[PDB]
């Protein structure tokens, strides 16, 4: 059955993939309000679309900084992929455009803030709470992988909580459409699969490992592999050892042993039954996947809010006036954007 749902999804996706939307708005159509988060070559700002009054989250990338960091192709990937996908737990890309200086991607604003903030503040989630979120990541990866996409940057910092307390995955900077295998060393140290660190060549199995890290971090309050130095983190990841808090249920430990499996030939989500080995695990036995997909399950908590455009669930960041050069930068490099 789900076989059928994905089939139809892929046709919709493929059409947009081959004929992407381009230049669907202009900077002056948006009122810029406040920075919601930052990256090495840009920022995301809360904006208000003037003609409709809708609030959006507008990612602003400096073309010159994208080039210096060798992220041209990754950025083209991000935008091409994001304009073609459609899933309840994936943030929507509403418009994209560019000007002399920047690339712009206007996405839905998710007012609940990052899972990261909530997790650090409360310490750790209960198992039911973690499970509810993990289920949404399982369904989202199921969708994304059926499209030959790898996500490649799962972590709490990249998951937003919506007004219903459900997850919205954002940050498709490393997403890629690949059949077979890829080699780029990218991701976030705590979340890297052993095969990335080992320069092995890798595939969608790395997303399932990262799901292992995420669930662990959500339930424990810290990740399974951490140190002051990335190199010491890498050594722990490839050591093939992991320890669980004593409050982890036996089912949770069993699940995580199978996700944080250093051996591709043994990792859940990478065997014959694919994602169904995860969906059918006892830890998920209480999970009604259809109810989750349909947003019929009561969330562990709803973010607090006061009036639209309220940002209390996001940290404050240093603000920086936008400047658009009188000269076009890196035209050819971003032609297709």
């Amino acid at each position: 059955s789900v076989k059928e749902f994905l089939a139809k999804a892929k046709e919709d996706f493929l059409k947009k993939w081959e004929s992407p939307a381009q230049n669907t708005a202009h900077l002056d159509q948006f009122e810029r309000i406040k920075t919601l988060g930052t990256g090495s070559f840009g920022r995301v700002m809360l904006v208000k679309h003037k003609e409709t009054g809708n609030h959006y989250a507008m990612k602003i990338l400096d073309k010159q900084k994208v080039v210096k960091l060798k992220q041209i192709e990754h950025t083209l990937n991000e935008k091409r992929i994001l304009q073609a996908v459609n899933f309840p737990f994936l943030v929507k890309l509403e418009f994209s455009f560019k000007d002399n200086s920047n690339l712009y991607m206007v996405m839905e604003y998710v007012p609940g803030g990052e899972m990261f903030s909530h997790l650090r503040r409360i310490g750790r989630f209960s198992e039911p709470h973690a499970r509810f979120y993990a289920a949404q990541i399982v369904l989202t990866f199921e969708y994304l992988h059926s499209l030959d996409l790898i996500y490649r940057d799962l972590k709490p910092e990249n998951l937003l909580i919506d007004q219903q307390g459900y997850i919205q995955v954002t940050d498709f900077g490393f997403a890629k459409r690949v059949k077979g295998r890829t080699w780029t060393l990218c991701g976030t140290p705590e979340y890297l699969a052993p095969e990335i660190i080992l320069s092995k060549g890798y595939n969608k199995a790395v997303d399932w490992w990262a799901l292992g890290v995420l669930i662990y971090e959500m339930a424990a309050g810290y990740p399974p592999f951490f140190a002051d130095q990335p190199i010491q983190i890498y050594e722990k990841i490839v050591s093939g050892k992991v320890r669980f808090p004593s409050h982890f249920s036996s089912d949770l430990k069993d699940l995580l042993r199978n996700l944080l499996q250093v051996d591709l030939t043994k990792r859940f989500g990478n065997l014959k039954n694919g994602v169904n080995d995860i969906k059918n695990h006892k830890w998920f036995a209480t999970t009604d996947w259809i109810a989750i997909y349909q947003r019929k399950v009561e969330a562990p908590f709803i973010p607090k809010f006061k009036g639209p455009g309220d940002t209390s669930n996001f940290d404050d960041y240093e603000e920086e006036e936008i400047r658009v050069s009188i000269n076009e930068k890196c035209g050819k490099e971003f032609s297709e954007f």
């Binding site: 090495s40 960091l69 060798k70 992220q71 990261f116 650090r120 310490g123 940057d153 972590k155 910092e157 900077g173 490393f174 060393l185 990218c186 991701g187 976030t188 140290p189 705590e190 424990a220 309050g221 810290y222 951490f226 140190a227 002051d228 990335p230 320890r243 808090p245």
Partner: peptide
């Protein structure tokens, strides 16, 4: 405790991606 060691580590803030 493992939790105390995490909180006292340099990696409890937002984590940057690596690119290269």
């Amino acid at each position: 405790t493992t939790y105390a060691d995490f909180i006292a580590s340099g990696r409890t803030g937002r984590r940057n991606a690596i690119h290269d």
